[PDB]
């Protein structure tokens with residue numbers, strides 16, 4: 324069996340934990356309990372392959388930035404999450420991606436852009452802005468909502484597929 | 493009338509440079525003995541504009557960045573004198589192991605014995621903090637009280653919790669997880685220690701947040717230790733505020 328090491332990154336309050344918990348425990352948390360670093364394991368089936376997901380749910384609070392250097396070397400793929408109603412979360416992904424490339428010394432590393440809270444009617448980040456930044460990065464883009472579970476499985480599975488494409492042949 | 497012009501001009505600074513802004517605002521208003529007046533406005537403008545307590549000082553807003561800056565500037569020497577004696581005792585410490593995740597546990601090591609070394613270290617750190625009231629720097633008590641006074645205006649039943657979680661999440665726990673990066677130690681601890689410090693900060697955060705472990709399955713066995721330290725933590729926060 325193959326193990327995929329996924330890391331979920333992004334600003335605080337974006338919904339990184341709510342998406343992970345929706346995959347692991349199949350329910351939506353309405354508590355906002357800021358994460359330090361959480362680890363989860365789950366076995367799924369993806370394109371007919373049974374495999375293990377080793378998920379690391381990281382801290383969006385900037386006070387814990389000294390921890391980023393370690394999980395970015397250990398992780399194979401990265402979910403970059405922003406909320407579609409918070410435009411500073413979109414500006415923060417710039418710094419996350421260019422700090423993953425600096426630590427891995429690679430201009431191409433598995434990565435998926437994720438816009439969370441699509442259940443919300445108010446939207447300050449249009450869909451064309453994220454799709455255009457995703458094409459700028461050669462990476463997919465998936466709109467998700469942890470509250471309604473729309474697109475959460477698509478998000479993790481497309482990251483696994485992006486990891487498969489980065490493996491030699 | 494220095495404050496109403498500084499608040500008007502802060503509207504202009506975009507979100508990319510809130511770090512420099514918080515530094516500039518605090519260095520400016522402290523050198524004029526008006527730090528308490530700046531913190532009151534900023535903290536009031538993030539409690540009045542909150543729907544509920546859940547989303548209050550979370551994330552990294554401008555007022556949040558000002559608060560973190562104050563903890564780091566006025567509590568720097570207090571945290572190092574408080575944590576340095578405890579870090580050097582657990583670093584130098586024979587055959588201690590802190591891995592409590594069964595998926596990552598070495599076969600030779602015991603789980604129930606690794607859990608007890610984590611709890612033993614957590615007491616020493618937790619007991620040191622709640623007994624440090626008399627060494628608190630005065631500038632830091634006014635920051636904590638100002639937050640407590642502001643949050644109590646609209647949320648009396650949650651003010652004590654907000655101050656404690658804020659102090660642990662943006663001041664103490666960052667230092668424990670990365671002591672070398674915070675200036676406390678002169679070298680990164682060995683990886684076995686770094687693992688324990690990170691796991692311990694999680695336990696301390698639960699006590700400050702007054703909520704039990706409900707997500708990671710390997711952290712639930714510490715819920716009994718967490719319940720027994722809620723009141724002692726609220727008494728320590730009631731003293732600072």
Ligand SMILES: Nc1nc2c(ncn2[C@@H]2O[C@H](COP(=O)(O)OP(=O)(O)NP(=O)(O)O)[C@@H](O)[C@H]2O)c(=O)[nH]1
Pocket residue numbers: 333334335336337338339340341342352353354355356357358359381382383384439440441442443467468469470471546551
């Ligand atoms: N409406 C809505 N709220 C959401 C959604 N996802 C998360 N939230 C809410 O946003 C808040 C923060 O969620 P959380 O998952 O803890 O975000 P986080 O990225 O883990 N925060 P941190 O980085 O500090 O650990 C909670 O109130 C949660 O209910 C979503 O898709 N829709």
Ligand SMILES: [Cl-]
Pocket residue numbers: 496499
């Ligand atoms: Cl004003």
Ligand SMILES: [Mg+2]
Pocket residue numbers: 339340341356357358380381
């Ligand atoms: Mg989280």
